[PDB]
Design a protein around this ligand. Structure first.
Ligand code: FUM
Ligand code: FUM
Ligand code: FUM
Ligand code: FUM
Ligand code: CL
Ligand code: CL
Ligand code: CL
Ligand code: CL
Lengths: 461, 461, 461, 461
């Protein structure tokens, strides 16, 4: 229960003895006791990449000592290895520049760095602002950390999950290509379609979002670092920003660059708005896919029952055949969350004033959440549902054999009028087209098997 | 690191030894590893009120023994006293009916209740479904918990915070009523207005939201309990729902009732959409208020600087006068979050099918978050900013004395043309209206003091 | 091609000879050539009610002669009778205060009024600003016209349409109360439900929205008239605003009042945000209802086919049975429009500054459109679909007789385990519950038709 | 007042004698009397491009006579030359596939084409379905017309207007580069910034949206034509779709292609969702630009007054200096409209079922409107405001001279402590930091004029 006494302009303040933040973080924590949404640790890691790269760049410019640079890099690598997650207690609902989380990283980095210097018997000392935040400002760091973290989240979470689900749907598309079912438009019976063709629509949806995500994610590589307070770059070396972007690229493997216009970099979030547009496009596609799956799996006796899906929750021995599509429900709830998150991001990006947009935490919070919700949603839906999508061939065959929508294939052989009578007769008398077409005398058994081939009704000719 | 082995139809599964949930919660936890948003503990407490009331109602109907009832009630009160929050690990992104969190409560309640029975040397045993979920269904419990939790959140968090901020603005309105400033419309100079009158606009915004919140929160008192699986009430006593609503009311002090139409109660969330409409109304109002405050406090030399706000973060000795309106920024970020949350809720309420809307967790998540973000946001903005709003009379007086918009008060005395000359001359020559009116010879110095009384320009006459 | 030459302080400008607006409307029209959305004529009528009432009120205050008042009233009644719709050409995308449409009404009224005075051989002349806009401002008139027009739109369009559709669903609910179908939750087969009971959920949705609409529409009765430029009421008689509200009430039969806080009245649109919350709630309900109808009508052979709906478009004689639910598609398209309109309104209401919110035209445009889209949508969906909803009892009877979800009723008679065997057997062997129950020897043919009463399975007992 | 009697399956129906549509359009018009939003004529022109190309392609395949092809092509070019706009009376709120507008084009084209054949003494006759709609379906035509119309609207309206406003802002950026003002962050005074630098942020926002619009508009070039009813291409030649896209490209000059996946092409609108994501990004950017402009223009005496904007509406001679930023208000209202439109589009794209998304009209309506509102908004704001943005140098110079934020440039010379004393003294005693620096004895006036150079404070060094 012990504490450490820190100091600032307002006086003495207790910090928990086992926590590495300083007086700024503790007063900021107390001054914004709002909500339940901690500032995402992913942006903290983005700050650590930035502070790591800044230490090296400042060293290169002869502005930071070797020992200090080594100690800051070490402390930054402590954060990035996930050893210090509990030393970042600030909420999303802080100041709109994200300054307090910037100084939270400055203080923790400095605390761990000074421990390094002492263990190595150094006379030097790290200070949060003069050293860890050197050449930086409260205003160009959080947008840099945000873009670093958002791009990494796309690369490490969203891309592999999109590819996982897409490859499964592609495989189902190829395996079920020979299965002919009855299409539905307006929810009404339509002409035949291969089950694999229907699945191919879901699959190409994911290909389209992948193409579009590659376009929009590229603009997130543009970093604000180097604009300092108002975008002019005052109090920074003319090479500092490019150097930092270079070292973040080195450490992450992603081709970050310093923005061509730092005034845009502080005042705009149109690049994140565009990215979130891709996320909403994917969300809507995933909702449509998930709805098709659960409708196709509906039943067992009063629904469509064209496919089965895996049962992951225990059912009832007295209710055999009931499988709730619970993975579809998760994915569609994720989908509507992304759509609401899209509202926030689009609004917040419009609300900038002069030299800075101060809505950056809420933008980071919503965009990141949309990324990992789509990522985890697709991965889980893939593993726990999509890989287990199987046709129920008996029900699909019955739909094909019982359908009246095949009758148009009789038109080249007996004419529009004779086919119409057959379709009307089958409708009124509850017959199949085969039963009707033979009882009218217009088509024989051999002719009907020769003239009506559903495998010739799912392609242009 | 010890574990307890539980079992279901899928086999044996390890539960952490110090955790009170059963095989269903543990399998559900593993099957939905999605996102970072745990199902809100507030809705767990709503479930605890429900399970508590249902134990008493079932006891009244002769369906539950006294010992089982007392043990379930005790277990529910353990949950409601905050002793068991760690035993509810499931995320928002689960089944769309919230079944899994229902069974999480059934298991934890059953676990604690059986401990009670054994500590009292009872031969009876509690079972999660047969006892804790007796007369209930997977489908009518979560909407009941949701409405219980949302209404309580309005009563305990949103209402007191709204009244706190509103009372403060009312006090500033009365204190600054005698302070005459220059209105602005289109951001252009306009006729005088009392500073208290401008604040009265903010205050009445909060009064209006309170009136509208009293109307919309009343519909959240309608509970689904008693409709069971599809709304028909099968497998429940005809009095069960009404008895449960009665006991929840007894235990909470809020006048809950069983819904007049259980089919609506399972399939619709229009009552929550209306409530969230009020929350969005408040959010937009608070954003406007917060923008007025930070614009009035802008400066110290290149802004409007009509007011001072308290400084909570440490400033700079080399930058005196700079106070960032950081509480305004927090409150506007909360405001735009609520607007996005409103998008989710409105969408999700439209997506029901047949006998059940299965978007309930995400609706609960967003609406609850909107309630406590507005509550915490208003409370903190009140304490850390609003109570410290003070006028800067020198700056306000200069705006009034330098304004050309007072010239219209000369019209009844010297005429429109005579006043127009004075206003045009003052604009061209950089004079005050007083200086211009004397150098034209149209008004004396004594007449100008008698004819231009700003305190007569802020009321109808 | 004839023109009339008007003039202002910019010079001479041609007005079409057959058009009654003046130089300012002509200049405003040329300065905002934006989009395709004319400022809605309904808000012009709101202005006409306002100018009419203002003329009488000013006459009562001894500020306007009787002949001028009579001529202005006449001109306003010309507008309200729909004789002058072509004299209002300005778009929504004008100034944010609606000033240009205010002066459009001032000029047309003045033009028609001077024709009246000349036709009655009067020597006086009406002026748009000095007479038609007397005691008013650019800023308090448009919000007044907006609230007048929106409330009337609720009364004359939305309320009759909501009652028409609600009464139809109520009638279907009563007629189809004896029809027992199979419920669906998560799209999976569930226990029985009366068709009327399922419809009763749609019906009660509309009752709920009617209750909530009566609450939110009441706040639209609060008018801004009397606040003038900034809310202080300067240049208006202290009784003017209340008198105007009184006479608008007299002429419309709606109980309008002058707002308690004119500063709120100019700067806030939270009352309209709340109203739009009701509209979005109704829109989401209508989407759910419309989706239920088209899914229930899906088929003829590969869907659910529980109901028929009227066919309004000619189909093909070669495709008998295909009826596209085109009215459902119209209603859901209207529904999503209302949800996007809700976004605009909530955003725009947050964006006010100081003494005036200047987003009033776009708020009017979106809110009015939502009202008449829901009104026309409900009316047409009622007339062209809802009234023709009919059950297909053969398909409904088959669902009920083929369902395994009735097996629960066997439990009190033979036990859980025997009933489970019957349900398992019926599932494996493709049997009905009756066929399975008699082949196991557990239930008699007479016992089955005595123990399984679906009419006893749709109520609590 | 004369009528022509047409007929269909339901009987005889009157079409106005001067209108060229047939019985199906007249019946569809009566059956959807919903709203006030006519189906945009732009999508009618997209249909005309499609019917033109389809006539040629069908002729190339030997499915259509030369004379029929020439007559259909002629009728289509009559539509595209704007001669027939009044013959398309159907509203947006029709069926969700757009079938009725498809048939509206089929009937008008057929009517005009038969007039051509009879004028050329031809015995052949055009039929709306068998000829004008040959090889097409109700379902793949409207998405083709939508993409054709949307892409053209981007090319002909949005792109030229974006470039106009951007080129203007670039010109102001270059002219005002030598003007040094005071930056604002959080609305608080900050370090200096060139006026041109601040404008460069606006300009680069438009560059960014141009880059992102080039990426997203490309996906709108993928057309559904060839998928026919369900995407399988049945009842169409395997080359038909590609031929149509080729001839639309020939006639428009835009590189349209037939979609790689027709099933996606009918069921998805993620390509339009992404495009509308760009439009919302631009809208948000334009709102920020417009707000900076009206805040910078605020005044004349109680605002910021750093710039002047042109006055387009006549003002009052008794209120000189009053210029309402009315073009800024227009542009921000357009901006929030685009944001609400984005909600509709994102929702509607998620709501497809199986082989067809039937939300296509509402998607077309909102996306087109967003395009032309931004286009007309940018063009008009450019012509009527942006081109006339001029600095008010005396006010900008006074901000720079009066600012305390320049003091940091004294640190390299006198140190942090002595500079802090100067800034503190200047703040307390209402001095310029020049007056304070000389009164402390720390800096000579020759030193101050040499050490403090704002032109060196707006770049890295
Ligand atoms: O962002 C901050 O808190 C520090 C300085 C400023 O940008 O005003
Ligand atoms: O959800 C459940 O666990 C059980 C039944 C149902 O709601 O279908
Ligand atoms: O809007 C007007 O026409 C006049 C004054 C103002 O409201 O700024
Ligand atoms: O819209 C039609 O032409 C009818 C059916 C379909 O093609 O889906
Ligand atoms: Cl009071
Ligand atoms: Cl009732
Ligand atoms: Cl009051
Ligand atoms: Cl250039």
């Amino acid at each position: 229960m012990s504490v450490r006494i820190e100091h600032d302009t307002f006086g003495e303040i207790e910090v928990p003895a086992d926590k590495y933040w300083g007086a700024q973080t503790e007063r900021s924590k107390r001054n914004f006791p709002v909500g339940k949404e901690r500032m995402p640790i992913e942006v903290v890691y983005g700050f650590a990449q930035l502070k790591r790269a800044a230490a090296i760049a400042n060293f290169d410019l002869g502005k930071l000592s070797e020992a200090k640079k080594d100690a800051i890099v070490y402390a930054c690598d402590q954060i990035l290895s996930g050893e210090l997650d509990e030393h970042f207690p600030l909420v999303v609902w802080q100041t709109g520049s994200g300054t307090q989380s910037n100084m939270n990283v400055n203080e923790v980095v400095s605390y761990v760095a000074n421990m390094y210097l002492k263990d190595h018997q150094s006379d030097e000392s790290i200070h949060p602002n003069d050293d860890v935040n050197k050449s930086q400002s409260s205003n160009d760091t959080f947008p840099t950390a945000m873009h670093v973290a958002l791009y990494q989240e796309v690369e490490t979470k969203l891309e592999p999950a999109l590819k996982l689900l897409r490859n499964t749907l592609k495989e189902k598309e190829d395996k079920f290509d020979s299965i002919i079912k009855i299409g539905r438009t307006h929810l009404q019976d339509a002409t035949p379609i291969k089950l694999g063709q229907e699945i191919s629509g879901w699959r190409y949806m994911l290909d389209r979002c992948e193409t579009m995500l590659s376009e929009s994610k590229k603009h997130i590589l543009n970093l604000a670092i180097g604009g300092t307070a108002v975008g002019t770059g005052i109090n920074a070396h003319p090479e500092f920003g490019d150097k930092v972007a270079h070292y973040i690229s080195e450490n992450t493997g992603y081709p970050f660059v310093s923005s061509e216009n730092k005034f845009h970099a502080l005042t705009a979030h149109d690049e994140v708005v565009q990215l979130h547009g891709t996320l909403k496009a994917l969300a809507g596609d995933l909702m449509k896919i998930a709805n098709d799956v659960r409708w196709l799996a509906s039943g067992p006796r009063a629904g469509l029952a064209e496919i089965s899906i895996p049962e992951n929750e225990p059912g009832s021995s007295i209710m055999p055949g009931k499988v709730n599509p619970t993975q579809c429900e998760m994915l569609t709830m994720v989908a509507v969350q992304v759509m609401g998150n899209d509202t926030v991001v689009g609004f917040a990006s419009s609300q900038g004033n002069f030299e800075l947009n101060v809505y950056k935490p809420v933008i980071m919070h919503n965009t990141l959440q949309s990324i990992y919700l789509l990522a985890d949603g697709m991965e889980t839906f893939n593993n726990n549902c999509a890989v287990g999508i199987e046709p129920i061939e008996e029900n699909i065959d019955n739909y094909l054999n019982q359908s009246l929508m095949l009758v148009t294939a009789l038109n080249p052989h007996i004419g529009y009028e004779k086919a119409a009578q057959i379709a009307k007769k089958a409708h009124k008398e509850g017959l199949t087209l085969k039963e009707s077409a033979i009882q009218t005398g217009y088509v024989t058994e051999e002719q009907f098997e020769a003239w009506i081939k559903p495998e010739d009704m799912v392609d242009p000719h």
